[PDB]
Amino acid sequence: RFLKVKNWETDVVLTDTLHLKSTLETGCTEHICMGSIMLPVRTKDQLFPLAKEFLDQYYSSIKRFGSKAHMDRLEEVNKEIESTSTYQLKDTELIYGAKHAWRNASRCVGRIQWSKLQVFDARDCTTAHGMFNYICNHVKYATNKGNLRSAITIFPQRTDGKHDFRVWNSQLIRYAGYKQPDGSTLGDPANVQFTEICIQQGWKAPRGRFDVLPLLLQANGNDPELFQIPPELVLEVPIRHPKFDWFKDLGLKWYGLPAVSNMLLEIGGLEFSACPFSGWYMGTEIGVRDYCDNSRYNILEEVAKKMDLDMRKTSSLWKDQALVEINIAVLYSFQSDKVTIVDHHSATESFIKHMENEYRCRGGCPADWVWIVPPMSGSITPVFHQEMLNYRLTPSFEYQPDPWNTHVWKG
Amino acid sequence: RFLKVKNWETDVVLTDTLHLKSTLETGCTEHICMGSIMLPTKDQLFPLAKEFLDQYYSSIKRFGSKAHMDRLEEVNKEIESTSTYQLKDTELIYGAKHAWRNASRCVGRIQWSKLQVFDARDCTTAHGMFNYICNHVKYATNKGNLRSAITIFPQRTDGKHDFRVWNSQLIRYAGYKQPDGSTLGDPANVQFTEICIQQGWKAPRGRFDVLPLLLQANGNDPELFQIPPELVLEVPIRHPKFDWFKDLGLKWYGLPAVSNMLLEIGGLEFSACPFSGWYMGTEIGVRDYCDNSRYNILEEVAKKMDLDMRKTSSLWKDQALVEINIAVLYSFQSDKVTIVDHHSATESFIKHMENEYRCRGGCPADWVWIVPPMSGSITPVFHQEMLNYRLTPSFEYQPDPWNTHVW
């Protein structure tokens, strides 16, 4: 079977066969599309097929399908599963696996980069202090004094689900949020609940607008422990504008390293619940979402005030005007400080080239349009005009519940 | 079976049950989402008729009344005898309002119950269609104080006697290829513009020539007509800050009037049902003006603003985009032609969703189309989960007539 996608701007038509290898469900049916819904302990029984499918994929990728090495590995994994109820990946399979989870991540516009990922194997880690050390090394490596390098650190896999490794932070580097008695918020309102947990755990909060949060780290199902990332490891960029000299006086900054730490990595049926990964920013993530969402820093008004835009009617488009200015500021600031960043034009244009190459070499590229299209200037990026097919391939990154919701506290 | 949608900005959770009434297919499966694909007998008719009549009689609080059971038997006799049936005027109006109400891709649905329905089922010729259409254009335009309207031509019978408007919209601009390799006017309309030429239209060959109507009655060959220019309200585009903007020579028309869709009510098919509302500014400023395959004006505008066009990261495209859209809204407002900005329209749609959830149990919505083509996340719809499903009565796409028509 063959499915076609059309770019309505170029008339380029692509043919997808890769979707045939998808088994996991989308949330949609013949009667309902759930394409805009954000969120739509394995037996031995279910494990061996998952391992077999993965190893078949791995051995095919290295051009050794059906080889003696391939067959011996299947047998070895089979034996290990029946005897121990799980199995261990070879370093080569882990690296392949992690890269492919990124390749398969339908919500990621940056996947042109997928084959360049530094994988840190942290499966020998046993304690929270051990995790802290691994994470510091990742942050220093990935940061590279502003010449950002993509990286992932992989902690031990789930065993019985009672001994999970988890990074409780949603990202390795994020700013604290504090709810004031008067109902206003200081700092990042997205991080209020998490900030509150850190405080309870014993963090001494500076109570400012951009306090880098401590790491809250859980090894082997134990209660999580707090650690402060050395400040010299946390690269930050003060935000200024190339023409507007008052922009610096907004007192804005952001961190250079975007590093997702709350997702679950699935490889061959194995579950890695702590697998922090990092790339580099696309400008709109900060300038559009972090700064201008109503439920985030919410700076549109203050910026438009300072620009002296007509604010009495939405139809002056003051908000759109201030939006572009803030996003120019973000890109200018990062580039001036030599911290890697990509603008949404460049990133989407690269994504289209990647997607086309993937169709040609792989038979497809699963992509979630709702997430791929940037949150400003949608239709002046080429992805807006690109039909996309969204389906789930493994290896994969998945959401998992917040750990404060599920953790059994030991004391 | 009961489905929740969350707004991530407000935490408001709504519960959808209306989807369970849905019947037609989405294009998606459990294995694949097709959310971003643009185009994903007497025996058949009686169930469709019944489903419709049932919802009509329920809507007037007469479900299962003697009047309800009388109508179902009368329609059933009519289908049994004629293989089709005729809608009462009340049914037709209800059907048309509900097709709009059900249009998952339309952000302007807060207005759905204020629709003027022009019954043109007595029409027989292209001159007659032309008359109905001029009357629709003049009524809807209302000297710039636009009113929503639909004109409904006779329903499909055996399918070789279709009424069709060949135009995609009642009012559009011509497109011309030259030796240049370039396109003058609207590249979207090149093929149609050429069909007009081959059928006899003498073209001014300019950038903004209002196209003629090409009208097909009763499956006959279509005929050309020029809409009286005094009936076509157009707006010159100027900027409230940039005096040079006027010299780009830009204008647009005031009346958005889709004329190529098919209205289905109670299984009956209305292949010619032009309808019109009023513009959201982005349709013109972002899409018509800035799509690479449309007027594609970003380069010329950026140049007049003297921006640094050497690198994408200066956001010269994005700056110019905003200015073009400011000009569109300013021009329509100044000339007193109804228009809505994307902020106002999307705020209205959120309120409409809330009304629909509370009063109807849901609102089918296609997020990919509802979120505006600029500044997505600063509009509330970006943060609103939506469920997309097909309800009837409906507006549907149909084949372009030129590919289908037997000459």
Ligand code: HEM
């Ligand atoms: C190299 C530069 C990269 C860029 C510019 C980039 C860009 C993005 C953006 C803009 C998003 C959507 C974020 C949001 O709106 O919340 C995203 C999502 C995502 N990316 Fe990337 N990415 C990069 C590298 C990576 C890497 C290294 C990985 C993992 C190895 C990754 C995996 C993912 C995943 C799993 C998502 C989904 C996150 C979610 O659903 O919350 N990306 N990417």
Ligand code: HEM
């Ligand atoms: C009153 C003001 C209205 C506004 C502001 C409005 C807004 C819009 C917009 C922005 C679109 C997307 C157009 C595109 O991107 O191609 C759309 C699509 C649509 N609207 Fe409306 N609308 C209005 C009135 C109407 C009326 C009166 C009807 C029918 C009675 C209608 C039915 C539809 C349908 C069926 C579509 C999908 C068209 C397609 O798929 O090409 N709308 N609407």
Ligand SMILES: Nc1cccc(C[C@H]2CNC[C@H]2OCCNCCc2cccc(F)c2)n1
């Ligand atoms: N440029 C890069 C590189 C790597 C990773 C990234 C994503 C990061 C950065 N900027 C946002 C964050 O992405 C992680 C947060 N994404 C939303 C998670 C979420 C919330 C609610 C519901 C739901 F389904 C999902 N960007």
Ligand SMILES: Nc1cccc(C[C@H]2CNC[C@H]2OCCNCCc2cccc(F)c2)n1
């Ligand atoms: N404001 C209003 C009021 C009523 C109606 C409208 C839509 C009109 C105006 N502005 C665009 C036009 O909409 C009709 C064209 N829509 C896209 C048609 C299309 C083409 C290719 C593939 C595909 F799937 C669909 N706006």
Ligand SMILES: C[C@H](O)[C@H](O)[C@H]1CNc2nc(N)[nH]c(=O)c2N1
């Ligand atoms: C409701 C809707 O699906 C939700 O707001 C999505 C839309 N698209 C997105 N796209 C990206 N990249 N990131 C997001 O957080 C979202 N949010």
Ligand SMILES: C[C@H](O)[C@H](O)[C@H]1CNc2nc(N)[nH]c(=O)c2N1
């Ligand atoms: C491929 C993609 O579905 C296509 O470009 C869509 C996206 N969203 C849209 N949204 C609206 N309102 N109108 C459109 O024409 C489109 N085009």
Ligand SMILES: [Zn+2]
């Ligand atoms: Zn879907």
